[PDB]
A = this chain, B = another copy of it.
């Protein structure tokens, strides 16, 4: 099963959260993370198309972010996550995350927060 994020370097992995948002991450030899994220969140803009992701990972923790602009649809917002690996009965793994969404609405800058759990899709 899963040991650490570092050993993912060289193999693309795909991960899905409870909203059906999917991301595919590529890990460089220093734990730099790049990839793409496809939002499926209900009632949100920028659904179904790929957005660039970047971050960092090591051992059992990871942090990454997505700015919701890809030159096709611009949702004027950014989300960032931090999470830890959790191994599942029968050799799967999840990333248990906390996230923030920054956007500039009516009453100026606002931040909203919540949780996401990503499951590795072999």
Give me the interface of A with B, judged by CB distance under 8 Å: 30-33, 52, 54-69, 74, 76-86, 96-104, 108-113, 115
* Chain B residues closer than 8 Å to A99, beta-carbon distance: 80, 82, 100
The interface residues of chain B lying within 8 Å CB-to-CB of A69 are 31, 58-59
- Determine the distance from Cα of A66 to Cα of B54 in the docked complex, in whole angstroms: 10
Q: Give chain A's interface secondary structure class.
A: strand
Taken together, the copies of this chain in the complex come to: 2
Known: A64-B65, A82-B78, A82-B79. A104 touches B59 (CB 8 A): yes
**CA A112 to CA B111, docked complex, whole Å:** 15
Whether A100 contacts B113 in the complex (CB less than 8 A), given A31-B69, A69-B31, comes out as yes
